[PDB]
């Protein structure tokens, strides 16, 4: 039993909700919140920009030190950093950005990072400003993640479509 509330159960381990991931994290304080990161961990907009804003830019400061030490992530890769005031940890995961011409096949590799954590709060990878079809992203999530994932979809209209179209 966990403290996630109001989710629709899609499969044995994948749940979904129309919610602002920032407000969800602040309420639940999960062990792991997933960020929709880029390889440079520059958290300018979308999910990443909103989460970073909620940390008062502490996420960005920590991220800049991580990049200065380690260099950029790989598309499809991840790193674990602090969750600051939002969660114990933040798993920064890089899904492909279609608006950069990045291979959509790397979306499965991106979701594989979730399997290293027993329970996560997360957005749909490569959705929103990353330019991929959120319906496709949900399919890859369900077919790749085996651990318990609580998915937050900010747009109410998109949420209804993901549910109604969910096979
Ligand atoms: O709303 C649409 C979804 C899917 C794609 C990208 C942004 N989305 C988000 N989901 C959950 N929390 C969020 N906070 C800020 C953005 C956001």
**Domains of the chain with bracketed CATH:** 8-163 (3.40.220.10)
How many CB atoms are closer than 10 A to CB 43?
24
CA–CA distance, 124 with 151 (Å, rounded to integer): 7
> What residues contact 80, with CB distance under 8 A and at least 6 apart?
89, 90, 91, 92
CA–CA distance, 30 with 93 (Å, rounded to integer): 16
Go through 62-100 and write b for each residue having 16 or more CB atoms within 10 A of its CB, e for each that does not: bbeeeeeeeeebebbbbbebebbebbebbbbbbbbbbee
Method: X-ray
Helices and strands counted in the chain (H then E): 6, 7
**In the numeric block, which tokens belong to residue 65?**
């030190």
> What residues contact 40, with CB distance under 8 A and at least 6 apart?
67, 72
How many CB atoms are closer than 10 A to CB 118?
9
**Resolution of the coordinates, Å:** 1.0
Query: If you take atom 2 of ligand 1, which residue's CA is the nearest one?
Result: 154
Give the residues surrounding ligand 1 with Cβ less than 6 Å away. Answer: 20-22, 46-47, 50, 123-124, 127-128, 134, 152-155, 158
> What residues contact 18, with CB distance under 8 A and at least 6 apart?
152, 153, 154, 155, 156, 159, 160
């Amino acid at each position: 039993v966990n403290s996630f509330s109001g989710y629709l159960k899609l499969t044995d381990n994948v749940y979904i909700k129309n919610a602002d991931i920032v407000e969800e994290a602040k309420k639940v304080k999960p062990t792991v919140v997933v960020n929709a990161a880029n390889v440079y961990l520059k958290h300018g907009g979308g999910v990443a920009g909103a989460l970073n804003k909620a940390t008062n830019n502490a996420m960005q400061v920590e991220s800049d030190d991580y990049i200065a030490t380690n260099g950029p992530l790989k598309v499809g890769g991840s790193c674990v950093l602090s969750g600051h005031n939002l969660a114990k940890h933040c798993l920064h995961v890089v899904g492909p950005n279609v608006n950069k011409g990045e291979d959509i096949q790397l979306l499965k590799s991106a979701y594989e990072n979730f399997n290293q954590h027993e329970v996560l709060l997360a957005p749909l990878l490569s959705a929103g400003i990353f330019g991929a079809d959120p319906i496709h992203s949900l399919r890859v999530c369900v077919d790749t993640v085996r651990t318990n994932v609580y998915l937050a979809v900010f747009d109410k209209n998109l949420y209804d479509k993901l549910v109604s179209s969910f096979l």
